[PDB]
């Protein structure tokens, strides 16, 4: 039995029943964690209330919320909505509601489910190519949901407006220079296109000053008809090494997870977004506090 004993793994390597006087080093004993330590923000919760009241903007004027130094409950927010689609990259859908981060970014808009295939970077379309693009580096999540009847205060908009052309007219008036959208940035054309596109296929143009390189900025907004209930899209991005504080889930505040008590013995720690195992000691301050 290879894993029974030290001599057993002695024998299973060397592939033999009569291992010579093979004086190994063998596998080591590792310590077991006698406790657990957790620190995080206390008495502050990430505030999703602005997401609840008012008219949600279009995809190309998505509103952004940035949370640092707070406790969050994403399950509560997703309960209040009828979740249609929920897909994550470099993070798992169960993990995004339970991990600790340094900053959480939640971008929300009004999006009709029909163009679900236009939200991935693959299958470019007009949305991911002119309206909204997520960063390829940090872990991301994408949510499609529908507001229920019982939730009254989200004032439904009048139509689903979204960009189809945002392009720059060079001084030659001959060349058309497309304006691709960069990750986590607004499209360059949001300054001219209004919040709601009045008519499917309308056009807008403005003349750029020489400081901006001259030329013309030309854009066009298309429209998809409303739905019975409003459909919205959420994008979540998380960062890790950016703040000295963290965005963590909420725990139960009656535990013995204090550093000063378990001083000198192996412990699990989740001090902030950073976690591991180790042994703590009282020690003279040495870095930047």
């Amino acid at each position: 039995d290879c894993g029974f004993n030290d001599l057993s793994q002695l024998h299973c390597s060397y592939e033999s029943f009569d291992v010579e006087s093979g004086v190994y080093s063998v596998s080591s004993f590792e310590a077991k964690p006698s406790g657990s330590v957790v620190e995080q923000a206390e008495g502050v919760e990430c505030d999703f209330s602005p997401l609840l009241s008012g008219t949600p903007p279009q995809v190309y004027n998505f509103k952004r919320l940035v949370f640092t130094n707070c406790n969050y409950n994403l399950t509560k927010l997703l309960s209040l909505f009828s979740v249609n689609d929920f897909t994550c990259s470099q993070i798992s859908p169960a993990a995004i509601a339970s991990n600790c981060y340094s900053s959480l970014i939640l971008d929300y808009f009004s999006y009709p489910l029909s163009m679900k295939s236009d939200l991935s970077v693959s299958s470019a379309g007009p949305i991911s190519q002119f309206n909204y693009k997520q960063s390829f580096s940090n872990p991301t999540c994408l949510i499609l949901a529908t507001v229920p009847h019982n939730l009254t205060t989200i004032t439904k908009p009048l139509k689903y407006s979204y960009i189809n052309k945002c392009s720059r007219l060079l001084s030659d008036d001959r060349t058309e220079v497309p304006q691709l959208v960069n990750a986590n940035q607004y499209s360059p054309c949001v300054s001219i296109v209004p919040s709601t596109v009045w008519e499917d296929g309308d056009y807008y143009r403005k003349q750029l000053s020489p400081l901006e390189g001259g030329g013309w900025l030309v854009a066009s907004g298309s429209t998809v008809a409303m739905t019975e209930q409003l459909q919205m899209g959420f994008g979540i991005t998380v960062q890790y090494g950016t703040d000295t504080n963290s965005v963590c889930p909420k725990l139960e505040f009656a535990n013995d997870t204090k550093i000063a008590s378990q001083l000198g013995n192996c412990v699990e720690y989740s001090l902030y977004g950073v976690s591991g195992r180790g042994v703590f000691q009282n020690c003279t301050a040495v870095g930047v506090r």
Partner: nanobody, 128 residues
Framework: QVQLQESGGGSVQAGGSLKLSCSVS????????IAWFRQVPGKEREGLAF????????DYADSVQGRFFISQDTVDNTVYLSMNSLKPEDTATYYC??????????????????????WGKGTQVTVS
């Protein structure tokens, strides 16, 4: 684990003043919001006010704004609801409510409590 209990209900002359109490128990974390509702019989529920606990800030609905006053004892963590100058239209069962989160009560009292998780037994009040 969380228990909400309303008390203090009774009948007073219209144009009087009254005060409820809503004992709250079972919170291990101080980050929550507590709201007051009322239910007129044979109709749908509708909210009146709420208090956000750590911040301490409070808000009221349009209909009873100024007329009502909400507060909370710093040692009992119980919320109140002071009615002044009551009217015949104020006959209903007053409900207490709470939530796991802290930011849902504002949407809640304006959506008849769609977001709440915790409900009290209620307390009927009728004005003569």
């Amino acid at each position: 684990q969380v228990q909400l209990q309303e008390s203090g209900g009774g009948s007073v002359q219209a144009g009087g003043s009254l005060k409820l109490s809503c004992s709250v128990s079972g919170y291990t974390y101080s980050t929550y919001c507590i709201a007051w509702f009322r239910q007129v019989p044979g109709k749908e529920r509708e909210g009146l006010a709420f208090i956000k606990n750590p911040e301490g800030n409070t808000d009221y609905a349009d209909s009873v704004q100024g007329r009502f006053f909400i507060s909370q004892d710093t040692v009992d963590n119980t919320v109140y609801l002071s009615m002044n100058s009551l009217k015949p239209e104020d006959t209903a069962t007053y409900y207490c409510a709470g939530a796991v989160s802290n930011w849902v009560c504002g949407m809640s009292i304006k959506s008849q409590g769609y977001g709440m998780d915790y409900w009290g037994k209620g307390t009927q009040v009728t004005v003569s």
